[PDB]
Design brief:
PDB class: viral protein
Chains: A alpha+beta (229), B alpha/beta (238), C alpha+beta (148), D mainly beta (106), E alpha/beta (299), F alpha+beta (54)
Keywords: baseplate, virus, viral protein
Strand order of the largest sheet of chain B: 5-6-7
Structural class of chain B: alpha/beta
Shape of chain B: elongated
Helix content of chain C: 10-25%
Number of helices of chain C: 2
Radius of gyration of chain B: 26 Å
Oligomer: part of a larger assembly
Chain A: Pam3 hub gp19
Largest sheet of chain B: 3 strands, mixed
Entry title: Cyanophage Pam3 baseplate proteins
Order of helices and strands of chain B: HHHEEEHEHHEEHEEE
Largest sheet of chain C: 5 strands, antiparallel
Organism of A: uncultured cyanophage
Distance between the termini of chain B: 51 Å
Helix content of chain B: 25-40%
Chain lengths: 229, 238, 148, 106, 299, 54, 299, 106
């Protein structure tokens, strides 16, 4: 657990979890005489290593019961279930021929994604699934009146926005971004959240987060970008 | 709870208090705002009559129908009965094949009414449907004992009602009073609402008067009568 | 394997062996399959192979492989044959490269330039059946040839 | 449906995703007749050019582009003028064929 | 105060009534000389606030209909049912679940609690409840003062533990399957009916009766599939239901009123169809196959 | 949006002039993911008996 | 809609939205240049509206919640409890009352629950409950559709109240003793069984058999006292139980594994010992005395 | 079981993993009735909206969401108030179904 936030003299508490940690590697350091303890942690890191499944799976079985099946083994390793939103093509597909599973869960999780074009990820010991062109419910406002730093920087698909770390910002959500520049950039307001970056300090380096989002179209679909085979 | 809401004039003035000093004495602007806000406050007051309009002891009309459909006892039921039909008997008397109504009967139904066209006697009086729902509360909970069936009967019929005998599979009840025609016609529906265990047959006293015998709670020579259980035909024509 | 030590300070070694691992997944190899139909010319079989690779954490099915070159144990026609019927088990083998028009033309090179495609499977008699399903009467001392 | 913003510029050009298509719409004011015209490009090809923006009708019906309907609306049918269209007194809306069908069925 | 909650329901004050009240308030404030035409600055304000007042009326109607199972939907439909502590079935629609709460006829409001709790069990495809409450055995074979249950599916332990708490002590059960149950050490043997399915072969001869030479009868398959659906639905023939010409005609005309059923023919498969009735005992049920049904149009 | 100079600014708790109006105008404070403090075994069993036993 | 009453419940609208909607509506009426700032009269109207409408929104939420027993609080909680037959006890807080509104919607009248209550009455040293559910009279003499209660000790009035609280009307009561208690002035004729204790003389002959570990066979008086305690304990032979070789051999063997039983002899004091088939009617019970038990080892 | 901290804010929102599902809870105070209310969304889908916080009952029982029991407690059975809920004089708890079963069996 790495809990970050703002604790103003009045107000209240804004502190929430931005990263839940399974220690990766630690190492002290002297600079003058100091001792800085540089921690690295683990994200689903018990599942990226020790999760191995055992599956015979027959024909006719729908195309989601076994995301539950794989989550059984990934749950033996202490992973929680997030929101799963499959593609519509996925929700309705059935089976002609049987479905090997022997080896490593994450490895053939990746082949899953490459094979039906969907995203899955682990966000603080909770595993979410979304479509490539879709996102999950939950919106977050970023404006010069709501924590905006500089540009809502424009990109090919969407934006990359800096702000003060303020905990809700999760991948696979929606951010509504307003400024005095995006209007003449004609860029929308709603964007999916794909990349999240947290950099901060307690004394000098203010809490800063940067969010990369790929724009949602008029169709309520994300601007995927040209996937190269 | 308690008083949910207050008088609209209280809410509106509570908001008028928040006006600015430069407008505190603008009678046209303040009265315009009062006209626009008092109407909304008055519209919303009307909701504070969705609180006890569903009280089982005093509900009427659609509010009682809604309670009945929550409790699972509808206002009307299929029966083996020639429901009276509102209409004229060609004055003195006409042969016909129906029976007629005269502005005061629970069997309110026309030729063209849908429940009537399929034999659904519909309970129109609230003071009887309310009693039927109060009794249905007992079937709901499965309170089949005497100590509960007696309160079911007190509510349906009156203080003189009693439960008489427990033979093998057959239980007798009595209102303890002469029944009026409305109650007589609705009687088949009373035995669908009373708390009597399934597989056990409900009876009714013939004269609907208190039963006689020995002991503490019954009626003697004056007022009592000899028992005679008869089939109310609550579910059958036979 | 992914993430030997943790969250997001993923070693450059991890995110390179992960690419090698994924590309090692991508290659095809053997797998058992069920014959769906047998062409009248007797060299291509419609096969519904019994393997699904891992999709959306769940069974999806890769489609019935078509015009799969059936491969009897013959050289120049001189050899042994087995009567292939709808419902039997074959083993599939992909090639290093596809051979589209080495079968469409016999002059010998397919379309673009790949390796190891799903669309390059030969079907073979030996290697397809399951050990659960028992083939009876395995003559274990004498060379046996069967017609049933 | 989606509302399309109009800037207070005589000539302008934006891009929107409609029915999974990248659509480039370019609006320009004709002062000689005091009107707005629009050109529409689907995937780089200008399929529509020089069409007047008029209220109350589907501007794309003649063309069968498969991207739904674009239409102008106003409180009382006031025509879209130089001042009126940027201010939002007349608004530009896009609706899909599905939404149009469901609304008709209503 | 004729509006709001009235014995006939929630009576809505019309938008025009709202606007008239607002105008009457403004006439008293500004005088008879005020202008309120629908296009004036004051008329526009009156329109906006009349719309807001009518929207409050809409909320009132919503709040009144949220307590009415016939209009309540979703989680509040479940909360209403929680008064009798009923529970929804998986995938069950609001129509279906409101029929259970209302007890639409049911033909006997009693034992509806048992009928619905039974249907709420996992796996129970079909269920039915019977009673013989006289001092004599009925023609169906049920002894007097007895409750009979017919159920398809669901584990016997769960079914019997449920039936035991609905059937009181001193009242017997009639059936062909026995389940031994125990609560607190006392053992009651619950008898239920697990109807035996007799495959039935059905052949129907129909005639075409076009209502005013308009839409003609549908194809033979389009009729056999519909008849199979009707016979497999929740209104399928029950146990002890003999197959008669009436039973099938009442279905064929109802589904396709432009068709006269001339000759029904039934048999116990694989035997040849013959003259009805096909007698089913109280423990037997007719089971139909999508192929066995045949329909033929006769000149 | 609050950028329109012809409209009022958005009601927010910070700029409300009273505690009551601050409560009414509180847009909402969203903590991140939370972990609940575990309850000791005997206290938890006692509380569960108190609640779900009758 | 997105606000108001929805399937998930009541979606209350924020004050900021209440204000923004009215500002947008005023722009629709008067154009985007209309001045609505906090200081202007129209801004005064918008702010006061937003406030009042948020208040009305909150009152709507409260009224919505007050139809659910699990959220109502007070006299309205009483209104909703009266649909399930509960009256707020004097001084009972809403918490305790809302807890009380969590109840079986089904009778709790199982004979296990009857017997448990019997065992709890003072003086009731022994009790057993039997039921005849079949349509035929069983061999123990219980008529069909009847519940029989055998009890020893305990006051008769309280036990009669107990039996009539658990046996529903229309179910018979078999027994030998009649009791007459009044509730609501309604005297009933409650039939119970007060078993007839007839003393029994028992003689058991056993063969000592050393165990596999090397234990010594138990003494005669230990055998005769361990049998007395078991036979006078809560697991005693009940009414209508025929003292038999099965019964006594099973008790003796289970108590003393290293001992085999040769024969059993049973009689009634003073009648001399005979074959172990002591016949008992459903009303009689086997009684015992410590001295009337004789055990003796057989070589 | 666990205790869920409540901030001194008239409207607050947080997320917690209950039975390995991401449950987002939003509490808001209703001044007119002086009572706290909660909405619950299971992994981004709003499943419970506008329920009143009441002491001594399971708040999630009607819905069968499969996320255990969410209940409020206080020493003398007070009702939750604007002041009393954030101060911890009334505590919000989550109990897992297995724990509830074990207590009921004990």
């Amino acid at each position: 657990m790495l809990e970050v936030g703002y604790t103003p003299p009045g107000g209240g508490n804004n502190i929430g979890i931005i990263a839940k940690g399974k220690i990766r590697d630690y190492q002290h350091d002297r600079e003058g005489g100091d001792i800085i303890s540089t921690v690295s942690c683990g994200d689903g890191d018990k599942a990226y290593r020790r999760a191995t499944i055992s599956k015979t799976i027959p024909k006719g079985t729908p195309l989601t019961e076994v995301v539950d099946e794989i989550h059984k083994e990934m749950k033996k390793e202490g992973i929680a279930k997030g929101e799963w939103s499959f593609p519509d093509k996925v929700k309705n597909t059935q089976l002609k021929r049987p479905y090997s599973m022997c080896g490593s869960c994450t490895r053939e999780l990746d082949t899953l994604g490459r094979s039906h074009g969907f995203y899955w990820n682990i966000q603080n010991e909770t595993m979410e699934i979304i479509p490539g062109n879709g996102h999950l419910p939950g919106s977050l406002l970023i404006t010069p009146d709501t924590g905006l730093i500089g540009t809502p920087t424009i990109t090919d698909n969407g934006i990359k926005v800096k702000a003060l770390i303020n905990p809700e910002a999760r991948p696979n959500r929606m951010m509504k971004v307003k400024s005095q520049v995006l209007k003449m950039n004609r860029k929308g307001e709603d964007y999916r959240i794909s990349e999240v970056s947290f950099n901060g300090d307690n004394q000098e380096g203010d809490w800063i987060m940067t969010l990369t989002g790929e724009a949602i179209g008029g169709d309520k679909k994300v601007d995927e970008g040209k996937k190269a085979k | 709870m308690s008083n949910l809401c207050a008088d609209p004039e209280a809410l509106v003035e509570a908001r008028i208090d928040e006006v600015l000093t430069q407008y505190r004495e603008s009678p046209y602007l303040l009265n315009l705002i009062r006209a626009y806000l008092s109407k909304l406050a008055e519209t919303s007051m009307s909701y504070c009559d969705m609180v006890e309009k569903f009280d089982l002891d005093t509900a009427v009309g659609d509010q009682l129908t809604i309670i009945g459909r929550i409790l699972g006892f509808p206002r009307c039921h299929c029966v083996c009965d020639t429901i009276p039909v509102v209409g004229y008997d060609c004055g003195g008397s006409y042969a016909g094949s129906y029976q007629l109504a005269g502005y005061c009967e629970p069997g309110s139904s026309w030729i063209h009414c849908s429940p009537y066209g399929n034999s659904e006697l519909c309970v129109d009086e609230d003071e009887i449907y309310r009693s039927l729902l109060k009794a249905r509360r007992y079937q709901m909970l499965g309170l089949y004992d005497i100590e509960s069936l007696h309160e079911a009967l007190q509510i349906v019929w009156g203080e003189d009602a009693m439960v008489a005998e427990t033979k093998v599979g057959q239980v007798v009840v009595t209102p303890g009073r002469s029944l009026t025609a409305t109650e007589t016609r609705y009687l088949p529906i009373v035995f669908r609402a009373l708390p009597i265990a399934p597989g056990i047959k409900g009876m009714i006293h013939i004269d609907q008067g208190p039963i006689a015998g020995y002991g503490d709670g019954w009626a003697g020579y004056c007022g009592g009568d000899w028992l005679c259980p008869v089939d109310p035909h609550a579910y059958t024509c036979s | 394997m992914t993430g030997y030590l943790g969250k997001t300070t993923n070693q450059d070694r991890d995110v390179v062996s992960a690419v090698a691992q994924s590309e090692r997944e991508s290659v095809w190899g053997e797998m058992p399959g069920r014959v769906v139909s047998v062409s009248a010319d007797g060299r291509t079989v419609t096969v519904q192979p019994l393997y699904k690779p891992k999709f959306n954490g769940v069974p999806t099915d890769m489609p019935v492989l078509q015009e799969v070159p059936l491969r009897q144990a013959l050289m120049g026609g001189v050899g042994v044959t087995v009567p292939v019927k709808p419902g039997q088990n074959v083993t599939l083998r992909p090639q290093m490269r596809s051979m589209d028009n080495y079968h469409v033309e016999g002059d010998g090179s397919a379309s673009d330039s790949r390796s190891f495609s799903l669309s390059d499977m030969e079907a073979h008699i030996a290697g397809g059946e399951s050990l659960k399903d028992v083939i009876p009467n395995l003559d274990s001392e004498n060379v046996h040839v069967r017609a049933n | 449906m989606i509302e399309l913003e109009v800037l207070d510029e005589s000539k302008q050009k934006f891009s929107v995703i409609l029915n999974d298509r990248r659509v480039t719409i370019e609006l320009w004011y004709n002062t000689t007749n005091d009107r707005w015209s629009f050109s529409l490009a689907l995937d780089g090809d200008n399929v529509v050019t020089g069409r007047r923006l008029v209220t109350g009708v589907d501007l794309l019906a003649p063309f069968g582009l498969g991207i739904g309907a674009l239409f102008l609306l106003s409180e009382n049918g006031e025509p879209p003028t130089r001042a009126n269209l940027p201010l939002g007194l007349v608004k530009l809306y896009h609706a899909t064929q599905e939404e149009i069908d469901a609304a008709i069925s209503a | 105060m004729t509006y709001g909650v009235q014995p006939t329901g929630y009576v809505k004050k019309p938008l025009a009534v709202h606007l008239a009240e607002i105008e009457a308030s403004m006439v008293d404030l500004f005088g008879p000389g005020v202008i309120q035409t629908e296009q004036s600055p004051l008329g526009q304000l009156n329109g906006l606030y009349a719309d807001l007042s009518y929207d409050l009326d809409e909320r009132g109607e919503d709040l009144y209909q949220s307590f009415d199972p016939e209009q309540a939907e979703g989680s509040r439909l479940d909360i209403l049912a929680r008064y009798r502590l009923l529970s929804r079935r998986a995938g069950e629609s609001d129509e279906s679940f409101r029929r259970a709460i209302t007890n639409v006829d049911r033909a006997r409001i009693d034992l509806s609690d048992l009928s619905t709790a039974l249907s709420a069990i996992n796996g129970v495809s079909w269920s039915r409840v019977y009673v013989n409450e006289d001092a004599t055995t009925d023609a169906d074979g049920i002894p007097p003062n007895t409750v009979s249950v017919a159920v398809i599916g669901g584990d016997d332990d769960e079914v019997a533990q449920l039936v035991r708490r609905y059937v009181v002590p001193g009242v017997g059960m009639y059936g062909n399957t026995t389940i031994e149950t125990t609560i607190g050490g006392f053992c009651r043997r619950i008898r239920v009916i697990r109807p035996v399915l007799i495959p039935t072969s059905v052949e129907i001869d129909v005639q075409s009766r076009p209502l005013k030479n308009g839409c003609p009868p549908p194809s033979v398959n389009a009729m056999a599939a519909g008849l199979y659906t009707e016979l497999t639905g929740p209104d399928r023939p029950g146990n002890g239901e003999d197959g008669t010409v009436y039973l099938f005609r009442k279905i064929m005309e109802r589904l396709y009123p432009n068709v006269e059923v001339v000759d029904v023919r039934l048999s116990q498969a694989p035997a040849a169809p013959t003259t009805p009735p096909l007698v089913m005992s109280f423990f037997q049920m007719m089971s139909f196959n999508a192929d066995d049904i045949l329909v033929e149009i006769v000149p | 949006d609050g950028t329109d100079k012809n409209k009022s600014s958005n009601p927010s708790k910070d700029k409300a002039a009273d505690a009551k109006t601050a409560d009414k105008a509180n847009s909402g404070v969203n903590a991140g993911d939370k972990g609940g403090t575990t309850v000791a075994a005997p206290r938890a069993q006692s509380l569960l008996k108190g609640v779900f036993g009758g």
